[PDB]
Amino acid sequence: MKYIQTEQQIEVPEGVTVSIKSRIVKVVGPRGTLTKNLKHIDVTFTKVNNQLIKVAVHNGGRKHVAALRTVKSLVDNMITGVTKGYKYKMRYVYAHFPINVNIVEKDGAKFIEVRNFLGDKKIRNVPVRDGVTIEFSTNVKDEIVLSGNSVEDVSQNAADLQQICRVRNKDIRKFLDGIYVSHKGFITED
RNA sequence: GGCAUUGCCGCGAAGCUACCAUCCGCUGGAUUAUGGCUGAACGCCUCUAAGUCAGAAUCCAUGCUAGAACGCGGUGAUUUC
Numbered sequence: 001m002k003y004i005q006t007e008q009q010i011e012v013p014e015g016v017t018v019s020i021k022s023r024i025v026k027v028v029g030p031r032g033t034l035t036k037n038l039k040h041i042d043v044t045f046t047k048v049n050n051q052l053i054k055v056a057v058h059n060g061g062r063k064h065v066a067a068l069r070t071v072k073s074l075v076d077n078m079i080t081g082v083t084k085g086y087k088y089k090m091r092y093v094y095a096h097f098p099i100n101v102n103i104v105e106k107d108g109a110k111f112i113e114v115r116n117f118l119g120d121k122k123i124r125n126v127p128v129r130d131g132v133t134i135e136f137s138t139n140v141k142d143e144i145v146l147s148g149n150s151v152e153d154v155s156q157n158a159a160d161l162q163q164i165c166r167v168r169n170k171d172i173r174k175f176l177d178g179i180y181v182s183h184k185g186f187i188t189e190d
Numbered sequence: 191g192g193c194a195u196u197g198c199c200g201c202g203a204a205g206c207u208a209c210c211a212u213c214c215g216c217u218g219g220a221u222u223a224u225g226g227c228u229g230a231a232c233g234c235c236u237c238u239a240a241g242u243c244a245g246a247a248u249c250c251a252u253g254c255u256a257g258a259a260c261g262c263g264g265u266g267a268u269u270u271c
């Protein structure tokens with residue numbers, strides 16, 4: 001319909017420096033730093049008062065101003081990931097064969113190996129994305145916690161660890177076996 | 191020794207040859223289908239719209255064959271008593 005001017009509202013908390021050049025966003029907070037390259041969107045960022053940044057689309061169609069809230073959510077995810085962090089908790093689900101998941105070291109690359117998935121002799125290796133740290137929960141049975149600054153890195157590494165444990169040639173409604181995301185949340189949240 | 195249009199029989203080196211004999215037949219990337227991540231549109235949801243992950247005997251390379259006789263390069267020597 002070619003909307004005149006659409007606005008979204010990125011709120012910047014304390015301790016967080018959101019420095020935006022052309023369309024390269026750099027968010028520095030207590031937990032670290034994150035950099036996004038939003039050069040594929042055609043939006044305009046304006047800082048209001050050091051706690052608020054507007055992002056705007058001028059003369060945008062429906063598919064263009066659909067990407068404005070995506071951009072606002074992406075920079076909000078950067079801000080949330082460098083303030084509170086991100087923490088995805090996965091559970092191992094098996095029927096008979098226990099899934100033995102360890103973290104292994106292969107010429108300095110930090111894989112997660114999965115052995116005995118449905119009695120396979122195949123060792124399923126999932127590399128750990130940089131920024132993502134892996135721990136295995138004590139006092140919660142069969143839980144792996146992937147945490148980091150980037151929701152994209154953390155959630156894609158969790159998705160990789162899930163997708164490596166897919167069941168082939170079987171009814172997957174009965175063979176419900178794998179590693180699944182049971183929780184998405186933050187590191188220091190209350 | 192000759193001739194029998196290589197006279198015939200047995201063995202027969204060399205050469206040629208046989209899945210009738212042996213040897214050899216490479217591994218990276220990009221993808222489709224599909225399953226996903228982040229995520230709006232549509233305050234929710236959503237693999238999709240922006241962005242992105244994995245992935246077929248596919249595709250393109252690595253490898254292999256020919257080398258443009260009007261594609262190119264490096265280098266040697268370049269004529270007399």
Ligand SMILES: [Mg+2]
Binds near residue numbers: 169170171
């Ligand atoms: Mg069957």
Ligand SMILES: [Mg+2]
């Ligand atoms: Mg005669």
Ligand SMILES: [Mg+2]
């Ligand atoms: Mg004779």
Ligand SMILES: [Mg+2]
Binds near residue numbers: 209
């Ligand atoms: Mg043959």
Ligand SMILES: [Mg+2]
């Ligand atoms: Mg989602």
Ligand SMILES: [Mg+2]
């Ligand atoms: Mg797709």
Ligand SMILES: [Mg+2]
Binds near residue numbers: 238
């Ligand atoms: Mg797309």
Ligand SMILES: [Mg+2]
């Ligand atoms: Mg890929």
Ligand SMILES: [Mg+2]
Binds near residue numbers: 217218252
């Ligand atoms: Mg290669």
Ligand SMILES: [Mg+2]
């Ligand atoms: Mg030639």
